[PDB]
Structures are given as structure tokens and as C-alpha cells.
Design a protein around this nucleic acid. Structure first.
Ligand SMILES: Nc1ncnc2c1ncn2[C@@H]1O[C@H](COP(=O)(O)OP(=O)(O)OP(=O)(O)O)[C@@H](O)[C@H]1O
Ligand SMILES: Nc1ncnc2c1ncn2[C@@H]1O[C@H](COP(=O)(O)OP(=O)(O)O)[C@@H](O)[C@H]1O
Ligand code: SF4
Ligand code: SF4
Ligand SMILES: [Mg+2]
Ligand SMILES: [Mg+2]
Lengths: 122, 255, 576, 222
RNA sequence: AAACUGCGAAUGGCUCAUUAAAUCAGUUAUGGUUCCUUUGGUCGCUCGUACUUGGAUAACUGUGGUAAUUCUAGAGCUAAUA
RNA sequence: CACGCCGCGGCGACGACCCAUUCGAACGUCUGCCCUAUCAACUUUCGAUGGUAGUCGCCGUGCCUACCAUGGUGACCACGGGUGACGGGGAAUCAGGGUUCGAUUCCGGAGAGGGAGCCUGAGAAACGGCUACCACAUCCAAGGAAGGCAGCAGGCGCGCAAAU
């Protein structure tokens, strides 16, 4: 309902703006991050899917919620600099699931052979 | 241990890096470099914890591989490169320049310098010898080896070098009456004018300093770094200017 | 709590020189009940197996330490996975499946080896040993918490890993399968390969006969085809060497490893264990009292897990589960597709005849015409008196218990004594005589049907396939059952076998079925045991070999140092 | 068995040689000695074959230096035959067979030294052209007999590659040790750095000699 | 993709069995020694085919042994910061 | 990689004899360790202390070899034995004093079943390297092959006593 932004650092090295979000929502549940992105994109004259928020902790008692948010210059700098789990929260990215134990068994079984056979030993 | 070590835990790190206890088990080990392991700042500490340009440890690497950060006017891709005690850390994308200077609590400060000031640094000359058909050499405290020095330069002097070229512009001789900074032990960071040196055969020499307030201390001779000629400092200083206030006056100043 | 037993080895236990400290330190001896009985004039200590309490006092008091403590299995109810009913069988543990390799399961029958397959395939939610109030799938997935399988069962519950089984009861499949082998196999392929699955399993010569046409060998190999073409990841192969000869058993073994993608989950369960060294990569083992409880051990390797089981002592636990290591002429039938031309051979009394065949060679047609049926040529012998006949596939239809069925419908005036002490007491049907014959599994069904065919008086006994649906332990029990029965009754018998160790032991006389397998056949004149196996194993081009200490027949690698030097002299098995 | 190889055309065949009176000119001769191969058939009249190794009855290979009929255990290393190390400096003790031929081998590998008069039905009727022809500068100019002004780039051997379902193409190897202007630019750069380095040396020497005479003026004035 | 080459595999982890002037701790020294790597110095200082030289061996192709291994043997090719 | 200027070139990654200092490592100095005399005399010319000349080592030296000298430690407790003895930063009690504990997350040492001996490498007496012997164990076609949880989980066993 009400966004206040604590300490603001505009960051010319990673091409973003860095700030700490305050969210006052005194009669409601914890607000979704999509609504925070729409309110801050209406605040900073930019489009809502170049801005990325994370880590919102609701304080004890029903009061404010305080987390981080960063506003990028363009989506291509976002596809270079943002972490892949945070892009995958937006549907811009998806990981191939094996994930760790079948890869390790395929790593210790591809040591037993030599030549072109490493491709056709799975 | 059957070889060199490659890791450094967090609670065994230096106190003046001001690390947490619960972010992880390990601290970044500084790379082998010009500066010692207990007496340096890596870049990953300096960009992540002091300036907050990068929140997590991968983003310091994403900063440094874009050839952004200059250490002494040279582009440095190692994120654990040691820097300290007037390494001029220069970032040209934002136009800022930083000189690593101990504040009077003993910690490496974020202390900003002028863009005209970042073409020089000071260096304490630690070893003077001759070589190889009489070529005189000079070894600074950050292991710059300079051939053909001024022949009045002796050990424990301070020279000023040009950071583009690597050549000596002028030098300061070690005396009483020069302004001084400590790089040292319990009296690390205090700035004053030298009053004495007691010379001992076979052991560390003790040098007595008197401050701008007039309170006096003394440290060993390997901890004394001459800043300037006379009482004129040659660099930009931190905002307290090296005067150690006691815990009573520091509480009264915080009041 | 497991029962512990003190175990003495014979070596380093010389009782004359170490002053008998084990007996004098024991507490059970120090009341006077003799668990330990030694003397200094002896060669061994003897520690009693039901008078040892298992408290470990005797172990530390020995000069030449020879005394081990060894578990004997019991009802534990510790990490139970599934129990079936009230006062019923309790499957304690679950086997662990592995990607890209084959898992074998060996053990006794009635121990729960098929029940383990139905839980890992999504076909049962186990009730965690609680049959009144079954926990549902959420709380099942918090009981395998901290294991791999509460990820693996999550792949089952959303069907992310599909599970198809081969059924154990292979003879009953055409009741839900109508028509031809070409139609019923090829509409459910869902992968159009159609090229390896028949040639590795000797098929497309059986594809215009009906699914109801096949005998039990060809009935078996059809079902190995119907799982293998299918697109899934989790396959369970129930007893795949049932009803098969040795040559087709190796071809079934090779095709199972052709089902390995490294993402596929293959576990198998065998009772033959002479192709198991060519079939699996890791082997779990099932101990316990049969049909009271069964537990799965940890997986051991192929060569390792067999020799653990054959000694019967598991080394990863300290558990010991076993201490033991007159004239007939020849004729032509053609049923509808192909003829069998028997050559006219002689016949004897008080001797044994063993048919040596192939998958479709005519064994279950030759055992019908000796009963006087299906005789289109003139001649062929009729026996003078009535005949006993065992069928291949027993699809029983009965009323009630077996005490009506065995004990008052065949020989209501019994022939005991002597019938039961010779025949029935090793065959152990007095324990299952309370249970009805309709609920029976294939092990007891085969075992109960032999009791009538021995229990009938007749002159020629037609006995076929005793090594279907049984484990390895009660397959040498059947051999001393049949040898001591018919050579003391002084009558003769036809025995029909697939297994190598059974057919070697009994055989007086040998009838060999030559020719092209299942397309034109000839039943030869009766040969001896020595030349009869050594001719027939030259039709397999497969050479057998005794392991020297547990007498197990093992098969040579096909072109090897042992194989070509045995096929040179034509001794395809020494001392038949 | 015998594994007979023809090195001139590169085809090999595996025959079963079953009588052992046929093989008596092979026994009691060491490895890599030519034998008179007239005696194991009628088709071998002018071919002499080289004994180039083999395997034991139990499958272990034969080494050239080992001088017995039986088997030894030797400490092998990098550069030895019958061994491939895992790590740098690994040595493992392995079992090999000697170089002496006897009747207890499983294969005796044979390389035809000189061709006879007849044709052997799998070896001498077909040739395979050598794939992956030469890549260096001088193996091309030595194979095709070029000269000091001749262009090496025009006589490289091409691989014609055809596949069902792919468009046809010709593919050539990357020629190494070829003097292009990139290499001459690198040499010119290195001689330029030699020039800059000695220019630095003599200018700093003259500068310090001037400054030292200026200082010794100041130090002689006491 | 593979294999050659270079580097790392000597750090991390785990436990406390040996060890009572030994370990270890503060201290002091290497003027009695080595130091991969980083960072600066040095690298036309030498008065005596070069517009770039040679031989192979792997990946690959082809024949196999051994019941059995991250076993490897014979034949044919071709590179280098080997 | 950038591309040229009328022969000559800019920016780099890689390279090495050497010197410096950077992580260290190694060997040394002064001082500090729990109980026992039912351990008061120990150490030996084949090394115990020292001298000279060497070998060897990365260097200093009985480190080792040759020749010569008869030394060295000791109730200010040597030497021998015990230890459920890794050492330290520390812990629990605590008026001041003490007493007891410290295997344990940081540092330093030692070892990968017992002992040895080595390859590579700057760095090892490496054991997620090799070579044997001892001890115990797996598969075998009885010709041979491969071993090391005091890594994370796990099972055996011992236990009062310790997790997926
Ligand atoms: N009803 C039928 N119609 C047509 N053909 C049939 C019919 N029944 C059997 N056959 C054919 O006659 C042959 C008889 O098979 P046979 O009884 O020899 O097999 P079997 O000996 O029981 O095999 P195994 O003993 O290995 O189980 C089969 O090959 C089958 O194809
Ligand atoms: N619904 C049921 N009621 C009673 N007993 C059952 C039921 N299901 C399984 N069992 C018991 O479980 C055991 C399963 O045996 P099985 O899986 O056939 O062993 P194997 O196939 O290895 O011979 C049998 O002994 C049987 O008595
Ligand atoms: S176990 Fe006891 S009785 Fe037997 S030999 Fe050993 S000491 Fe003697
Ligand atoms: S286990 Fe117990 S009863 Fe058995 S021999 Fe040992 S002490 Fe006696
Ligand atoms: Mg079953
Ligand atoms: Mg049949």
C-alpha cells in the first residue's frame, strides 16, 4: 500500500540502482512482490520487469515489511548481471533437472572408458 | 601440512577486516602479492563490505572481469589481490579515487582523494644495494624494484613516485622534525612529528613521536612511515587526522 | 531383538592345550544346563544352539580365540515396511533400486519376493504394518524420510517414472488376451522398433498361431517380449527362467541388459542362478522364516552375492540364516502347424526316462499320446492299465480345502502307512492343508499337484516340469522324492525337466528331441546318459562345468580356454 | 590363432591355424625375427612374415626384452610397452610374457615383410587410402616435391565427405608452420621490444651518470 | 564430443594411537638454507633453412587376446607451447 | 586482437637464466610440563662429550666415515618406569588463594591396519599414489586379478553411552 525506500545507492558498475524497500501494509497480509514491482515501477518511470526484488521479511506485530530491490537499466544488463535463480523466478530462465546425483554417477561411470565410448556410455 | 596452505578461516582472519561470524566458515585468503597477509585488504572485502557496490561474492567478480578497477593505475582481475597503505584504488566508470590509509582506530578507511592527486604515492625504501656493473637498486615497501635512484637515498626514507611511469620524483630523509605515520602495532594510525630515535646494536630501534595534541608514543623503527617534510603532510588525511581521542572524549564527541 | 548364538569353528579350537576356559566361564554351564560340552580328550568344543543365551561371556575367556558370536534371525518388527493381514506375512524392508543396472533377488519361496515388486512399482501403497488403519501417501513419504526413495516414490506418484512388471503367473495370460500374437503384441508397442525383440528372443515364427496355442516355454518368451518393447523406466522381471531351456535362458539374459538405458530402472528376481552371473550387476538377498516374515538385505555384487547365499551366512550383518551349503512304435501328429515324427524306441520297467528338449519341440505332445490321446497314425502303444498324468499348466477348479481335495477325493482309503513318511513328510503339504487350493501361489500349486500324481497308483507316471515356480532349495528335495519312490514301488516313470542339475541326477535313460526347433521335429531312439547329454549339449553348443566345492553347474564363456578344449573331446559335461 | 597384418595396404585377417606341425618354423625364435613363411599353407610362397608380438595363453602381452618361455612380473613405467599410467610417475608391477615364441600362445601377430607372388583373399585385393593426410609445411612440401618459391597452400590433400541427408562439402586441415604476415608481425614486434629495452637502458645510464657527477660536486664541497 | 599438452590432485576433511624438554607457547635468529605462484627489476650487455628445421606417438580407422580389471597387444594415419 | 603507415609499428595471453619480496617450510636460542626412589647413579671407541680433515645434505652441525682426546648429565631429581597424556588458546566451579578438566569446530603436531622403501613434483616418505613383508579379507575357469571409511551417510562389533 505504501512503499518507502531506505538508503539509495545508484551503482554505475553493475548498471543498477540499489535500495532497501519499506512496505507498510497495516491491515493486510504480506503483499506479493509483483505489486511491489508495479508500485516502484510507477514510482521510478520504468517498466516493471527490469526491476528485481528479494528477501522480504514481515516484522513482528503486523507492521512494516522490509527487504531489498534493484532496478536495472535494461533487460539485457539484467540477463548479464542478475543471478539465474532470480531470473528463473520471472520465467526468463529454466534449469535442466538431473540434478546432482545422476550427474555424479555419470561422472564416475565415464571414467571407466576411453575414446569415443564416453559419449555412448551414459 | 606437507606443502603451502591455501585457505583461511573467518575467526583467524585479521581483526581490522571487520568480518562477521555467521556468514560462512571461510574468509578470503589474500593472494600472494606485494603486501603481507595480516596487513592488507583484498578487493573482495573492499568492494563488498566497505563500499557496498556488490552484495554477494559473485558480483565482485562480475565487477572485476569487466576491466573496471585499477590498482595503482594497473587493471587487476584478481578479486583477492592484496592492497594496502597508499595503493591508489581507482575506479574510472564513476570517476572516484581511493587511497588506502589507516584511520586512527587502525582500520583501512574509505578515504577519497582528488583526481589530480591520484598520479602519485609514497614508498618507504627498505633495501639499498648495488649490482651488476655498479647499478644501484632501490626496493620499496610494496616491492617495487627501482634501478638508478638518487644517491642520497638511504634505508627508512620515503620517496614519491609517479604512478604512470614508476620513477622517483623526490625523496624525504628520515629525521627528527618530519611528520610521521605509524603502520604498526598498538599505536597504529597515529600521526605526529618525530622527536627521537634510540639506537641499539643488534635489536629493533625505538622512535619517539610527539603528536599534534602533544601526547607522545614510541614504536619500533620498522613501523615508522614518514608522510611529509616538516609538519607538512604530502597526502590527503582521514577526517580525524590521526589524533587518538580516548574513550571518554570519543563518547563525548558521539554526544 | 536379534537372537545371538555362540559359534565355534573347528580350526584353532584344539581342546587339549588351552584348559577349557570357555565352559568354566559360561553362566549357563554354571547352573548345570550344558550349552557347552567339552573334554580335554576331544577335537572340538560343542556349543548348544538352543541353550546358548547369546551374552558374550565365553568369547573373551579363550586362549586360542575361536569363538564367534553370530545372529540368528527372528521376528524383529524394527523398520517394518508392509504387512498383509491379521496373523499374516510381514515384509520388513524395501529393496533399493538403482539407475542403469540390473538388480537380482535370490532366496527361498514364499518369503515375499513378489510383494517387494508391487510396492516399488506403484502397484501398492504399503500400510506400514497397520492393516486396520492404513496411513495414506503423505505419511508414507515421511517414513522413507532421509532415504533416496521419498524422492523416488515422488516420481511414482506423479508418474514421472513409469513402472511395468512382467507377471509371475505367466500361464494365465490368454484369458485377458484374445486373438493372435501379431495383433495383441503389436498394437501395444508405443516404440516402433519391432526388430531386436523377436531376434534376441527367437520369435516371428510364432506369430500366426494364437496366443492360446503356445506351450509353457513359448508362453514364457512371449511375455518377455511384451514388457521389453514398452516405453517406461521401471521394469521388474518375475522369475524369467521359468519354463525355459538353457539356450533360451541366455538369450533372455542378454535382452534384459538390452533394456538398459542409464536412466532406466531394472530389477529382476531369479531362482536358477547359473545365468545370474551374466544377468545382473548387484544382488539383494531375502532371508526369514517362509511366509511369517521376510527382510531384504543390502545389495552385494554379482559374483559376491551368490557365494554369500550359497554358504547361507551374510557378512554385512552377522546373521546366519542357514547352516547348510514295454515297446511303442513311432508316429506322426500335426496339431495344426508342424509334425513330430517319433522314431520307434524301446521301453523298460523300474527305470527313469528324461526328455531333453527345446521351446516347442514336442514334449507336451509326447506326454499326451502316452495317455492315449491325439493319435492320427496307425499304431502307437496303449498302456493296459490307467495312467497318471501331470499337466503343464494347472488352472485348478475345486471345492474348498485340500483336505477334501487331496485326502477324501483321491485314496479316501489311504495308503498310509507307508505313504506319508516316505512321500508327504518331505513334501510339507501338512502345513498348508488348512488353506484352500484357490488362494495358492505357484510354488505351493506345483507342490500340491505332484502329491496326487505320485499318490495315484498307475504303471507309467507322466510327470512334467517340477522345476517351474520353485526355489533352488526344494529342487534337490524333489529329486530324492522321485528317485526313492519309483525304484521302491518298482514301477517306471516319465519325467520331463528343463533344469540341468535335476536332469543329471536321476536319469537312467534319455529320450532326445532332435530336428529344427518348433518347425519340424523328431524324437529319437532312447540313448544313455553319457552320450545323450553330450549329443544334446552339442545341439546347444553350450558347455557345462562343476564348481568344485558346492557342485554347481556353471556355463563356459562361448569361445574360451575351457570351452574349446571341452568341445574338442566332446565331454560337454564330465561324469553326467 | 594368427593375426596376419599387411602394412602396405592396411588390411588384416584372423585365421585359425590348428595343426602344430604346421607351426614348427615359428617356435624357439624370438620376436621381430623374420621367418620363412612357406610352411603353413600353399598360398604363402614368397611372403616372409615378421613376428611382432602376441598374447599369452592367459591373455597377457609379450614384451621384446623379456627372454623366457614363461611369465615374469616387471616394474613398468611411462614409455614402456604393455602399460599406461594413471598419474605422472606411477609405476605398477605387471605380468608379461617373454619374447620367445612357443606353442602356448593364444595369438601370434604376424606382419608380412615382403609380398610374394600370389594374392591372399582378404589382404592383397583391396587398398584403403590413408585418411587425414599431412598437416605440417614440410611434410606437404616433402611429399609433393615443392621448391623455394612454391606455394604450399594449393596442394593440401582434401577430404571429400559425403553423408546421406547432408549437403556435400570439401574440408581441409589447418596448415601449421606456415609463414603468414601474422608471424612476421610478431617477430617485428619482438625486435621492436628489443629496441625499446636497449633504448631505455642507455638513456637511464647517461641520466644517472649526470646525476652522480652533480652529486659528487655537492659531496666534494665538504 | 574425444585424446595429446598444461595445471591441481601436497590445501580441505577426519581422528588422537604413538609422543613427558619431545610436542607446544611467548622470544630471538638465519650473517647457516630452499621457495611453484603473485608483484616490480632484468631479458640487440655475448664480437661468434631463419620468409620457421627433424623424428615420432595419441584421438580416429582396422585385426584380436583374457573367465576376470580404469588390462591393453599387433596394423594403418596426422599435429604441438609434447 | 587491432589494423596500417613509406622498411617501421600498437595492445595483449604464454615463456625463462637470474635478482627482489609474497605465502610459507625446515633447522636453531633463552625459559616453562602431571605422578613415582618399592628407579641413585646413568651414558661408550660400532657415537656417548669434544678436536681436525672429509663424505652427505637444501644449508649449520657426530648427520656419517677416518684418526685423536676422556668426556657429558646428576637429590637444583639425571637415568628408568607410569599415564583412561596430543600441546596451547580455553572450560566448570570460585571471597582471596586454590583445585580439577581440555579427544572436541581456532592454531601447532602426528597418522591413515602394523612397519618399511620410493616414483613424479617447487612442495610427500603422499596412502581418495606405487613397491614388497606381516595381518585380515573378496572374486577364480584355481592359470590369476584387486584391496584399505581415523571423508559424508550407512551397516557389523564392542558397549551404560552417540543422528538420515
Ligand atoms: N491348439 C493349437 N493350435 C495350433 N497349434 C498348436 C496348438 N497347441 C500347440 N500347438 C503347436 O504345437 C507345438 C506343441 O508344443 P509343445 O507341447 O512341444 O511345447 P512344450 O514341449 O510344452 O514346450 P516346453 O516343454 O518348452 O514348455 C507348439 O510349438 C505349438 O505351436
Ligand atoms: N493378500 C495376501 N494374503 C495373505 N498372504 C499374502 C497376501 N499377499 C502376499 N501374501 C504372502 O506373501 C508371500 C509372497 O510370496 P512371493 O512374493 O510369491 O515370494 P516368491 O515370489 O519369492 O516365492 C506369500 O508367502 C504369501 O503367503
Ligand atoms: S573354546 Fe574353550 S574348550 Fe574349546 S578349545 Fe578353546 S579354550 Fe578349549
Ligand atoms: S553366548 Fe553365553 S551361553 Fe553361549 S557359550 Fe557364550 S557365555 Fe555361554
Ligand atoms: Mg516372485
Ligand atoms: Mg512344456
Amino acid at each position: 500500500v505504501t512503499i518507502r525506500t531506505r538508503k539509495f545507492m545508484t551503482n554505475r558498475l553493475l548498471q543498477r540502482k540499489q535500495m532497501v524497500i519499506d512496505v507498510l501494509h497495516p491491515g493486510k497480509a504480506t503483499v506479493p512482490k509483483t505489486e511491489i514491482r508495479e508500485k516502484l515501477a510507477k514510482m521510478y518511470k520504468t517498466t516493471p520487469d527490469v526491476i528485481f526484488v528479494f528477501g522480504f521479511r514481515t516484522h513482528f506485530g503486523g507492521g512494516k515489511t522490509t527487504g531489498f530491490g534493484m532496478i536495472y537499466d535494461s533487460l539485457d544488463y539484467a540477463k548479464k548481471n542478475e543471478p539465474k535463480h532470480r531470473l528463473a523466478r520471472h520465467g526468463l530462465y529454466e534449469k535442466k533437472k538431473t540434478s546432482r546425483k545422476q550427474r555424479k554417477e555419470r561422472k564416475n561411470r565415464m571414467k571407466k572408458v576411453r575414446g569415443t565410448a564416453k559419449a555412448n556410455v551414459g | 601440512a606437507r606443502g603451502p596452505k591455501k585457505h583461511l578461516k573467518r575467526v583467524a582472519a585479521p581483526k581490522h577486516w571487520m568480518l562477521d561470524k555467521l556468514t560462512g566458515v571461510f574468509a578470503p585468503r589474500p593472494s600472494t602479492g606485494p603486501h603481507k597477509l595480516r596487513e592488507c585488504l583484498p578487493l573482495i572485502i573492499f568492494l563488498r563490505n566497505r563500499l557496498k557496490y556488490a552484495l554477494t561474492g559473485d558480483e565482485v567478480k562480475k565487477i572485476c572481469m569487466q576491466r573496471f578497477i585499477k590498482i595503482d593505475g594497473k587493471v587487476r582481475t584478481d578479486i583477492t589481490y592484496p592492497a594496502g597503505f597508499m595503493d591508489v584504488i581507482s575506479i574510472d566508470k564513476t570517476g572516484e579515487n581511493f587511497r588506502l590509509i589507516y584511520d586512527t582506530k587502525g582500520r583501512f578507511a574509505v578515504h577519497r582523494i582528488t583526481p589530480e592527486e591520484a598520479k602519485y604515492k609514497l614508498c618507504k625504501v627498505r633495501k639499498i644495494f648495488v649490482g651488476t656493473k655498479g647499478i644501484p637498486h632501490l626496493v620499496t615497501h610494496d616491492a617495487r624494484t627501482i634501478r638508478y635512484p638518487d644517491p642520497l637515498i638511504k634505508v627508512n626514507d620515503t620517496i614519491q613516485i609517479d604512478l604512470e611511469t614508476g620513477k622517483i620524483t623526490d625523496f624525504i630523509k628520515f629525521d627528527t622534525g618530519n611528520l610521521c605515520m605509524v603502520t604498526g602495532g598498538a599505536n597504529l594510525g597515529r600521526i605526529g612529528v618525530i622527536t627521537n630515535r634510540e639506537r641499539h646494536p643488534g635489536s629493533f630501534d625505538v622512535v619517539h613521536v610527539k603528536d599534534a595534541n602533544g601526547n607522545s608514543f614510541a614504536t619500533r623503527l620498522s613501523n615508522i612511515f614518514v608522510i611529509g617534510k616538516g609538519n607538512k603532510p604530502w597526502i590527503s588525511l582521514p577526517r580525524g587526522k590521526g589524533i587518538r581521542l580516548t574513550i571518554a572524549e570519543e563518547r563525548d564527541k558521539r554526544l | 531383538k536379534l537372537t545371538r548364538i555362540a559359534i565355534v569353528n573347528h580350526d584353532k579350537c584344539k581342546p587339549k592345550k588351552c584348559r577349557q576356559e570357555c565352559k568354566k566361564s559360561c553362566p549357563v554351564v554354571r547352573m548345570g544346563k550344558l550349552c557347552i560340552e567339552v573334554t580335554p580328550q576331544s577335537k572340538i568344543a560343542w556349543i548348544s544352539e538352543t541353550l546358548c543365551i547369546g551374552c558374550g561371556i565365553c568369547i573373551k575367556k579363550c586362549p586360542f580365540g575361536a569363538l564367534s558370536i553370530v545372529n540368528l534371525p527372528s521376528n524383529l518388527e524394527k523398520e517394518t515396511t508392509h504387512r498383509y493381514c491379521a496373523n499374516a506375512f510381514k515384509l520388513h524392508r524395501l529393496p533399493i533400486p538403482r539407475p542403469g543396472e540390473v538388480l537380482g533377488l535370490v532366496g527361498t519361496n514364499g518369503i515375499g519376493k513378489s510383494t517387494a515388486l508391487k510396492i516399488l512399482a506403484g502397484k501398492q501403497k504399503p500400510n506400514l504394518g497397520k492393516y486396520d488403519d492404513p496411513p495414506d501417501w503423505q505419511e508414507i513419504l515421511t517414513y522413507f524420510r532421509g532415504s533416496e526413495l521419498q524422492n523416488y516414490f515422488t516420481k511414482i506418484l506423479e508418474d514421472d517414472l513409469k513402472a511395468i512388471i512382467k507377471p509371475q503367473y505367466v500361464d494365465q495370460i490368454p484369458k485377458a488376451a484374445k486373438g493372435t500374437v501379431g495383433s495383441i503384441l503389436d498394437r501395444k508397442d508405443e516404440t516402433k522398433t519391432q526388430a531386436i525383440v523377436c531376434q534376441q528372443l527367437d520369435l516371428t515364427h510364432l506369430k500366426e498361431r494364437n496366443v492360446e496355442d503356445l506351450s509353457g516355454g513359448e508362453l514364457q518368451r512371449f511375455a518377455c517380449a511384451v514388457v521389453c518393447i514398452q516405453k517406461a523406466d521401471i521394469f521388474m522381471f518375475d522369475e524369467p527362467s521359468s519354463y525355459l531351456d538353457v539356450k533360451q535362458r541366455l538369450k533372455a539374459a542378454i535382452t534384459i541388459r538390452s533394456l538398459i538405458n542409464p536412466d532406466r530402472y531394472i530389477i529382476v528376481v531369479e531362482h536358477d542362478l547359473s545365468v545370474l552371473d551374466y544377468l545382473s550387476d548387484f544382488i539383494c538377498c531375502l532371508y526369514g522364516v517362509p511366509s511369517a516374515y521376510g527382510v531384504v538385505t543390502m545389495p552385494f555384487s554379482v559374483r559376491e552375492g551368490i557365494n554369500i547365499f550359497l554358504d547361507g551366512y551374510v557378512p554385512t550383518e552377522n546373521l546366519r540364516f542357514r547352516d547348510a551349503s514295454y515297446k511303442y512304435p513311432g508316429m506322426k501328429k500335426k496339431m495344426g502347424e508342424f509334425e513330430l515324427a517319433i522314431v520307434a524306441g524301446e521301453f523298460t520297467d523300474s527305470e527313469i526316462m528324461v526328455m531333453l528338449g527345446e521351446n516347442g519341440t514336442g514334449k507336451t505332445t509326447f506326454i499326451r499320446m502316452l495317455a492315449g490321446r491325439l493319435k492320427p497314425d496307425e499304431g502307437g502303444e496303449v498302456p493296459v492299465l490307467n495312467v497318471s498324468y501331470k499337466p503343464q499348466k494347472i488352472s485348478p477348479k475345486s471345492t474348498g480345502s485340500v483336505r477334501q481335495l487331496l485326502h477324501e477325493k483321491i485314496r479316501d482309503a489311504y495308503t498310509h502307512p507307508q505313504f506319508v513318511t516316505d512321500v508327504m513328510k518331505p513334501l510339507q503339504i501338512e502345513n498348508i492343508i488348512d488353506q484352500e487350493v484357490q488362494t495358492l501361489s505357484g510354488g505351493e500349486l506345483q507342490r500340491v499337484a505332484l502329491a496326487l500324481c505320485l499318490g495315484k497308483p498307475a504303471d507309467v507316471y507322466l510327470i512334467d516340469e517340477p522345476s517351474a515356480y520353485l526355489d533352488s532349495e526344494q529342487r534337490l528335495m524333489a529329486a530324492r522324492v522321485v528317485k526313492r519312490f519309483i525304484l521302491h514301488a518298482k514301477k517306471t516313470a516319465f519325467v520331463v525337466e528343463h533344469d540341468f542339475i535335476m536332469a543329471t541326477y536321476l536319469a537312467d535313460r534319455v529320450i532326445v528331441f532332435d530336428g529344427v526347433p518348433s518347425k519340424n521335429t523328431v524324437a529319437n531312439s532312447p540313448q544313455t546318459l553319457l552320450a545323450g547329454m553330450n549329443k544334446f549339449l552339442s545341439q546347444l553348443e553350450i558347455t557345462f562345468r562343476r564348481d568344485p566345492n558346492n557342485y554347481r553347474p556353471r556355463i563356459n564363456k562361448l569361445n574360451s580356454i575351457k570351452d574349446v578344449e571341452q568341445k574338442k573331446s566332446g565331454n560337454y559335461f564330465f561324469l553326467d | 590363432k594368427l593375426n596376419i597384418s599387411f602394412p602396405a595396404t592396411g588390411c588384416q585377417k584372423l585365421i585359425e591355424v590348428d595343426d602344430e606341425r604346421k607351426l614348427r618354423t615359428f617356435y624357439e625364435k624370438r620376436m621381430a625375427t623374420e621367418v620363412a613363411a612357406d610352411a603353413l599353407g600353399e598360398e604363402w610362397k614368397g611372403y616372409v612374415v615378421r613376428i611382432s608380438g602376441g598374447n599369452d595363453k592367459q591373455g597377457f602381452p609379450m614384451k621384446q626384452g623379456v627372454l623366457t618361455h614363461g611369465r615374469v612380473r616387471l616394474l613398468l613405467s611411462k614409455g614402456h610397452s604393455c602399460y599406461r599410467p594413471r598419474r605422472t610417475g606411477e609405476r605398477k608391477r605387471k605380468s608379461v610374457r617373454g619374447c620367445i615364441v612357443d606353442a602356448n600362445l593364444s595369438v601370434l601377430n604376424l606382419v608380412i615383410v615382403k609380398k610374394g607372388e600370389k594374392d591372399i583373399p582378404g589382404l592383397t585385393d583391396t587398398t584403403v587410402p590413408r585418411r587425414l593426410g599431412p598437416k605440417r609445411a614440410s611434410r606437404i612440401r616433402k611429399l609433393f616435391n615443392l621448391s623455394k618459391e612454391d606455394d604450399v597452400r594449393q596442394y593440401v590433400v582434401r577430404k571429400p565427405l559425403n553423408k546421406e541427408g547432408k549437403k556435400p562439402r570439401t574440408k581441409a586441415p589447418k596448415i601449421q608452420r606456415l609463414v603468414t604476415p601474422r608471424v612476421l608481425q610478431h617477430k617485428r614486434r619482438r625486435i621492436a621490444l628489443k629496441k625499446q629495452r636497449t633504448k631505455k637502458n642507455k638513456e637511464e645510464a647517461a641520466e644517472y651518470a649526470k646525476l652522480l657527477a652533480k652529486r659528487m660536486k655537492e659531496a666534494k664541497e665538504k
